[PDB]
Structure formats: C-alpha cells, structure tokens
Design a binder for this molecule. Structure first.
Ligand SMILES: [Mg+2]
Ligand SMILES: [Mg+2]
Ligand SMILES: [Zn+2]
Ligand SMILES: [Zn+2]
Lengths: 452, 452
C-alpha cells in the first residue's frame, strides 16, 4: 500500500532516520535536511516581502498560560513556577506585543518565526505527519487598527499559501472549518486540505481571524488620532512539516522520489560515459559544463565516482534529481549531449552551445506538468451525494472526498459525523438546496472525508 | 562604562528585548534577527565546503545520559523515564552514529547542526554572553579511521574558525586549555579567546580532540580492509552567540553600532535630498540607483520617508549601515553623488557611472581597516610578568591579558590562580625559562586574565 511505499523511500533516499531512542522524535539526515532547506527558501522569499522574522524563546510559564510536556526541576531543586514546552506561542508573544504597541502610527505589524513545537500523545506515531517534536513549524501573527483590515489580511494570507503551494505543485481544497473545530477563541478559521495516495485527507495550512478577544485578554490597546484607546484586531496562521510530507507522497512514483526543480537537492546531475578511450577529453569537457552552470545559478553536481554508470542512473533517479545530463565520445565531437527527464523518461539531444536555456525551459515544463497531473488526480475523487446512505457507500468504497449540501446547524452536522464516521472539512457559501440529512434549507456546499 | 553602553545600544538599535517574563530568556527583534541571519550565512558558507548539516531532536533520556532542566510529566501523568533539555548532543548523536558506521569505506564523516541549548543557573544574567537559552549554537562532530587524521582535523578545524573570525574582523589568542578545564573525557581542548572593552576576556570557540574514549563508551566500531574491528577516532567543536556579542562590542563606537559589510542589515542606504525644487527628478534618479544595485547583488535600501534628512543620518548610522549615499539637485546634474563612510566619517564624491565598483572597493577597505584597528587595541593589552606580585599589580591596574612562563604542573598552576584570583587561559609550546611561581624549568608560554 501507500503506507509501505512511504516508509521504504524515507529510508532508502535517506530522508529521516526513525531509529531514535524515543518514539515520535526523528532525525533529519543530510539528504532530508537539504530538501527541507530548499523548501524553506521558497517559503521565506514570499513572506519576507511584507513580513518581519523574529524569534521568541522555547519555555512558557504556568501562570501566563492559565497534553503539554512540563519542566519541573532544575536538577534536584524543584522550581517555583513550572515551565512548559511551547504548545503555541499565543501565551507569550502577546504579552510582549502589548509593550511594542502604543500608537496607531505603529500599526500594522506583521511577524513570523520558524520554530519547533511539542505535543504529548500516545497510540499514533506517523512520520512527518504526526509526532511529538515538530521540527519545522512556521507561524505568523499580525496586528491591525480596524476590524476590516483584519479581514483583508485573512485574504492576503490565503493568496500567499496558494502561491507557496503552487510552487510545490500541490493541489488543495479551501474551505471554512465548522465552529466546533475552529481555533479556540477565534471568530473563524479557514483551512487548506489535500488528498493523500491512501485516499485520506491531510490538513496542510490554516488561517485564523481572532478578534479583539486576545487583545482584551492580554491588554493590547493603541491610542488613536482622536486620542482614545481601543483594542487591536489580529490574525494568525501557519503550516508545518506536513508540507514536506505531501510533496514526497503526491509526486510519488515507482522509481522513487520525484521532485519540483526548486526543491530537489540538485537540479542537474552530470554523468560522464567512459571506457578507457579518450577518457581525458570527456572529463575536461564535463567540467567546463559544471563550472559553467554553477556560475549561472544552478544547483549542479558531477558524479566523478568510479562505478557502473547504469547504477548512477538508479541513485540520482530514486533520489529525485529532475534532469540528468549524459556525455559520451560520440556526442562529444558533434558538440552536444543527451538530457534525460524524470517526470516522463524522454531523453532529448541538445547542443552544448545554448544548453543553459534548454535546461531552464525543461525545468519550467516539469513543474507545470507535475502540477497538472496532480490536480487531475484530486478533482476526480470529489464525488457528490444526496442521501446519507449514498455517502457511506462511497466513502467506504472509493475513499476520497464527498461533496454535499448542508443546513449548517450544529446538531445536524455532528450527527452526520457520528452516523457516517467521518469529519466535516468545512463550508463554502454557494447556491441553496436541501440538506443531505435533515432536509431543511441548505445554504452551504460542504465536504467530508476520512482524515489523518 | 562598557556594561552600560552595551545594554543601551541593544535596546536602541532594537537588537533584543530583555523584558521577557523569565530571567535569561531573551527575544530577538527584527533588526537583531537580521544581523544573526547574515552572521550565519558566512559561517555556513565555509562549513558547507566539506561538512554535512543535519538536525537531531531536543530531548534526551535519563538513561542514555548516565544543572540540567528536567521534563517529568506529560500533563498530570508522571512519565517513566525523564527527558532532559539538551546540555550537549554527545549523549544521543553518538548512539545513532554507531548505526551509521560499519566499514572503513564509510569514514571519514563530518556533520554539524545549529540548535538551541539549555543551562540552569542563578546569580549571573548577562545578555548574549551568559543565559539560560542559547538560541544560536553551532556544533560540529567528526569521525575518523586513524588516530593521526583525527589530529589533522583539529588543525583544519582551527584554520576554519580563523577564516570565520577574520571575516567578522575579530582578533583572537589561540591557546590550549589546562587539563582541569579541558572537555571531560577529551585528550585535549584548544581555545580561541578575545578581549572585551571592559578589559575582560571572552571565550568564543573551542576545538576538542576526543579519542576512542567515546567510541568505546557507545560502541563505534568499523570493519577494516584487513577485516578487523577497531574503534574510531573523533573530534568535536563549536561556537555560540557570543560571537555576535563580540562583533557588537569590539567595533563599538560613540555614534553606536559599526559593523562589517557582510554582517550589517543593509550594506548601502540611499537618502534623497529635496526641498520642493525638482523633487520629481531627484526621486526618479534615486530609484534607477536602487534597482541597479539590487540587480548587482547589493543589500540596498532607499529611505523614502518624509522626515528631516539629518535624522535619517542619525538612524542608519547608529544602526550600523556601512555606506550612505546622498543625492541632491546640484550633484544630480553633474551626474554624481556623495558617499559617506561609517568607520571614519570621510565623505567623497564619485560619478554615478562607475559607482558600482567604487562601492565594492570601499567595502573591502572598511573591513580591513576595522580589522587592523581591532588587533592593535588587543595586542597592546598583553603584558609580560616575571614575579607573581608583578602580575597582581598589572591585573588589578591595567586589566587585559598577562604573559608569563610556566612549569606546567597542576598544583603550581592552580596556586597561581588562587593567589592572583585569575584563570589560566592555556599554554603555547615555546622556548624555555623559569616558572613565574615555582622557579623550576618552564617549557611553556602561558596567559592569564579576568574572564566572563
Ligand atoms: Mg471532529
Ligand atoms: Mg578555572
Ligand atoms: Zn441539515
Ligand atoms: Zn611552576
């Protein structure tokens, strides 16, 4: 199944090593780390346009807070106010925000940090999808003057995760979580969901619109042009390692890892073909290619090693390198080489002259291609239902996502869950109809699925 | 004094905010973070030549270990094996290294990670120099086949910290810590020390040469060409935030922060001078300068704002920007502008044509200049002494570093410390003489000082 493929590739391409002396704490190995490093480069290059990165501490006071790991002793000495490994920054980024805000001249403000978080759980240990220590977790907070601009932010926020995701070539379904699932205290939480190969659903990003609710709890006032003092309007949002998890799974494959060009470890890998004849001329030619690519902004690599070229083909291919460039005596003379893709298999033949541009184009192609395929496979698993019994049938038989109309009342909604044993992703305001369950007027389009 | 200058600048240039609800945990603000981000870019660009970055977890088992914060409960449930916030990775990067090594074909190996560490202390809270949570701590570990190559690594390691430090323009004194200070279990630890403005000494980097000592404790064997199994030779080394601390202090100044060009937030800042006359032509000209610099690899900024230009001068100058470029009507016509330095004050006048190169040169200059000055001020605080009473006199009167000859026996050494109330930095094998204390033969050149 998928679950087996997944584990086996993590270990084979050396992404993470699970053999750590504690369940739920995993080690990033060289290759894995590299992919994560490039994934973050993309993310940060977007955020950094109008956001400011910072970095708060790891421990949070028992007091300020009012399944969380607790720090009690400082050796053998019991301390006098317990310290907790950060659940979510809420409790202490805020009190401080109180001190930074004191004039409508200050607002708006947009911060974010990439930190690690903790959650104490049992009976559920799934790699990169559910652990005890979430190594890569980006969270952004924003402060505003008017209740309107808050909502405008929520929109911008969304257009941001779209761009990010589009770059990883990942499909998504944007809805609006039900009030029993929204973020505690928030006005309303919005969610990004994507489909896994095992026909289940993964949450890969949320945007929350708090109110003045927290502003009040922690006292965050700002004096106005009219010389008064009102609380601020704020919003937060974040995404985790799951993003990395999905990029591996979604663009799966039988050969192994297949990755977007700006996420792979190396974009291009140059393999030389030699058999003792003209060896000296082939190499001296492979170099003039690497150094020419490096000094052009290319994450390039040259496999110097002494092994059966056929094997080199295997390794770099299971690992995820997009484009492979082969050089042989024959092609040498003419002044050209062979270029093998990864998403397809097609090996064309281009001239070593304007090769720099041929490669850039091929890269663009590969993404677009991988992206499309991706949406086709998802859209086709979104089926409609009009009778609760029609749902169960489909859920149990074709997994995937299930579309339907819903009244929107709580009870009605929760009973759908208990009968079908599913979770309601969220609404999407659209034309009327009649609820798939209680029959009354249904003013919303909703979704269901089995989730991670 | 220095201590006051320091705090006041941290707050004024918004580097870190100390007002956190716990003593010893501080918050990196936007500006501070930026400096740290660029400091790490330099560091990583060197390490990445022959090292491989990774990332282990934060918690370590009470068992595997055998003033450290302890995690006991998982809510209200007491756990069955306490978890400790990582003192040093030793205890769990190693057991894992055991599994990664199994053939002399595998060695050598060179890893490293940039993580956060913890230490529970009291009565000593000094910003960036001594805290509870060390946010930026780089640590590298290496595994080897022969006991010789281990030592070769120790040498390379050193030549690496030299290059790093030279880039920050920081002076250092390399010695070899005394056996009562070396790293527990190691054969011998080497140290890098630098002088603070308050005439005290700061440790800014160590290199340790463990042996087979740990290899044995954790079982790290590798099978040989001769088909046998011997333990490995390993070495570790690291540096922390102190590095950032020193760069601020060493290149101090009355105006404020003065920084190396590759460490400052912005390398260049363009200020436009306008008074309602030809305003439209001055701006349209300042832009053609920013976009021309950005697309040339320049961390540039344009102060659009509407405020008294004299103030702009103050802000960017207290913050640390190296070069300021001013544009006015007069200079506009001619086709040139004014460029003000930061280390000096000198404002030259160059032509807007080949300005790209004039700036690059000026940057090179500023570093070299700042570096030199730096060593002059340190070397001059290293005074010699021949009688214990001559030491005390100088230490108590001119602070600084004190040179002398030493026999090298422990007792003798420790008694020097207790009588003069100082710490012995380390030896430096050189010609003989007679010990400043016990009179016997002194085969080593040693150093003393009051430290942080
Ligand atoms: Mg639920
Ligand atoms: Mg001592
Ligand atoms: Zn209903
Ligand atoms: Zn002596």
């Amino acid at each position: 199944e998928f679950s087996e493929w997944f584990h086996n590739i993590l270990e084979e391409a050396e992404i993470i090593d699970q053999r750590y002396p504690v369940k739920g704490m995993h080690v990033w190995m060289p290759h894995g780390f590299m992919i994560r490093k490039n994934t973050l480069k993309i993310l940060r290059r977007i955020l950094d346009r109008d956001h400011e990165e910072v970095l708060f501490p790891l421990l949070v006071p028992e007091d300020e807070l009012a399944e969380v790991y607790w720090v009690t002793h400082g050796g053998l000495s019991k301390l006098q106010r317990k310290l907790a490994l950060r659940p979510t920054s809420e409790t202490v980024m805020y009190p401080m925000f109180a001190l930074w805000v004191r004039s409508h001249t200050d607002l708006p403000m947009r911060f974010y940090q990439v930190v690690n978080t903790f959650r104490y759980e049992t009976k559920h240990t799934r790699p990169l999808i559910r652990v005890r220590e979430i190594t890569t977790f980006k969270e952004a907070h924003t402060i505003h003057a008017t209740a309107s601009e808050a909502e405008e932010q929520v929109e911008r926020a969304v257009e941001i995760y779209k761009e990010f995701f589009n770059s990883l070539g990942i499909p998504y379904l944007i809805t609006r979580r039900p009030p029993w699932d929204k973020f505690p205290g928030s006005e309303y939480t919005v969610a990004f969901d994507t489909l896994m190969p095992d026909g289940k659903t993964l949450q890969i990003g949320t945007v929350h619109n708090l109110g003045q609710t927290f502003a009040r709890t922690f006292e965050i006032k700002f004096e106005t042009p009219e010389g008064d003092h009102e609380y601020v309007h704020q919003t937060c949002y974040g995404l985790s390692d799951r993003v990395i998890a999905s990029v591996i799974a979604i663009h799966g494959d039988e050969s192994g890892l297949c990755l977007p060009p700006d996420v792979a470890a190396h974009q291009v890998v140059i393999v030389p073909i030699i058999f003792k004849k003209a060896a000296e001329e082939v190499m001296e030619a492979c170099r003039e290619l690497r150094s020419r690519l490096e000094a052009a902004g290319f994450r390039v690599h040259l496999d110097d090693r002494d092994i059966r070229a056929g094997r080199k083909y295997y390794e770099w291919e299971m690992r995820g390198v997009p484009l492979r460039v082969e050089i042989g005596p024959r092609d040498l003379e003419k002044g050209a080489a062979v270029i093998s893709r990864r998403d397809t298999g097609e090996k064309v033949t281009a001239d070593l002259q304007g090769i720099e541009e041929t490669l850039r184009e091929l890269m663009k192609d590969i993404l677009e291609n991988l992206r499309t395929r991706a949406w086709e496979r998802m859209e086709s698993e979104i089926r409609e239902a009009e009778t609760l019994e029609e749902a169960s049938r489909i859920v149990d038989e074709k997994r995937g996502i299930i579309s339907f109309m819903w009244c929107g009342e709580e009870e009605c909604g929760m009973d759908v869950e208990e009968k079908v044993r599913v979770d309601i992703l969220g609404i999407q305001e659209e034309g009327s109809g009649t609820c798939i369950n209680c029959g009354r007027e249904a003013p919303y389009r909703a979704y269901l699925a089995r989730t991670y």
